[PDB]
Amino acid sequence: TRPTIRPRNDVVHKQLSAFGQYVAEILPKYVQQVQVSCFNELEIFIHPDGVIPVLTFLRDHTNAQFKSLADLTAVDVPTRQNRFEIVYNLLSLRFNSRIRVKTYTDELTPIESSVTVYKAANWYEREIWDMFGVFFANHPDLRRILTDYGFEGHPFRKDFPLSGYVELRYDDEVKRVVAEPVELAQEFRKFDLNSPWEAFPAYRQPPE
């Protein structure tokens, strides 16, 4: 158990659990769940409407002071009714801590823009719009950031094909670069690697 196994830190676990309880008590209107991971990471699952309040508290409360936005991104889970999972990662330099805030949305429900709370969110939100198609309300300048001009679709969605739908090439007749339906000389070879035996008993699900 000693040499090859990652050591635990119970002090950080207890501190993060106490602070999660603190945050949940302060904002019952929006906090739905609090978790502390086995490697001491604190996550708070909230309601979408509380995106702006919660973050503001976490940035401005004297005991939180999470003044840095490390990252903001989305996760696509098609099996859920609310497809998209919005994740905020925040860093507090005063207390040398990190926090995660999660919420959810679907294709037609907008999320409140948090550029007023963190100016770093701007491009991040644009990226989430470009890769996933999640609209952010009251964004100062929302448009594509990563994809090509005129690109249709949202590539990071799970149902989006890996190679996309169109490819580009130079055409000498029209004397310009044109886009055409995609054709692959060698199709990408899909591998089925999942072993038919269970790996982790601790994560077994009920048999429904």
Partner 1 sequence: GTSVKPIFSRDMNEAKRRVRELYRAWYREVPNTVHLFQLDISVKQGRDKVREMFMKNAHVTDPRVVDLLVIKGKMELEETINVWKQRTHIMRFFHETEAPRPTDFLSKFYVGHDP
Partner 2 sequence: SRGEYVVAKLDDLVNWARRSSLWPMTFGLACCAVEMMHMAAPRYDMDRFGVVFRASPRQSDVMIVAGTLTNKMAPALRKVYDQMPEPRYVVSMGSCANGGGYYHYSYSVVRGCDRIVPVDIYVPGCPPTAEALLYGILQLQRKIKREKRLRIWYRR
Partner 3 sequence: QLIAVDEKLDITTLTGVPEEHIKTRKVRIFVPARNNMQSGVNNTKKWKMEFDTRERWENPLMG
Site residues for partner 1 per CB under 8 A: 108-110, 135, 137, 143-144, 149-150, 171, 173-174, 176-181
H helices present in the chain, as ranges? 10-26, 51-60, 121-132
State the binding partner of 163 from partner 1, partner 3, partner 2, none, CB within 5 to 8 A by kind: partner 2
Which tokens is 16 given?
A: 């993060």
DSSP-derived 3-state class of residue 174: coil
Contact status, residue 88 vs residue 73, Cβ threshold 8 Å: no
Which residue in 18, 37, 93, 164 binds partner 2 (CB under 8 A)? 164
CB of 83 to partner 2, least distance (A): 19
CB of 120 to partner 1, least distance (A): 22
Compute the C-alpha angle 155/161/163, nearest 5°.
90
State the binding partner of 81 from partner 3, partner 2, partner 1, none, CB within 5 to 8 A by kind: none
110 vs 161, beta carbon nearer partner 2: 161
CA dihedral 66, 25, 104, 16 (to 10 degrees): 50
Residues contacting partner 2: total by CB under 8 A: 20
CB of 187 to partner 1, least distance (A): 15
Place of tokens 């990226």: 127
53 vs 153, beta carbon nearer partner 3: 153
Residue 150 near partner 3 by CB under 8 A: no
Q: Phi first, then psi: give them for residue 67, nearest 5 degrees.
A: -90, -5
State the binding partner of 197 from partner 2, partner 1, partner 3, none, CB within 5 to 8 A by kind: partner 3
Which residue in 177, 193, 199, 202 binds partner 2 (CB under 8 A)? 177
Please compute, for residue 166, the number of CA atoms within 13 A of its CA located in the half-sphere on the CB side: 12
DSSP-derived 3-state class of residue 58: helix
Binding mask 134-163 for partner 2 (x = CB under 8 A): -------------xxx-x---x----xxxx
Amino acid at the residue 32 = Q
Distance separating alpha carbons of residues 136 and 3, to the nearest angstrom: 48
Write out the residues near partner 3 by the rule CB under 8 A: 107-108, 133, 151-154, 157, 159, 165, 181, 185-187, 194-198, 205
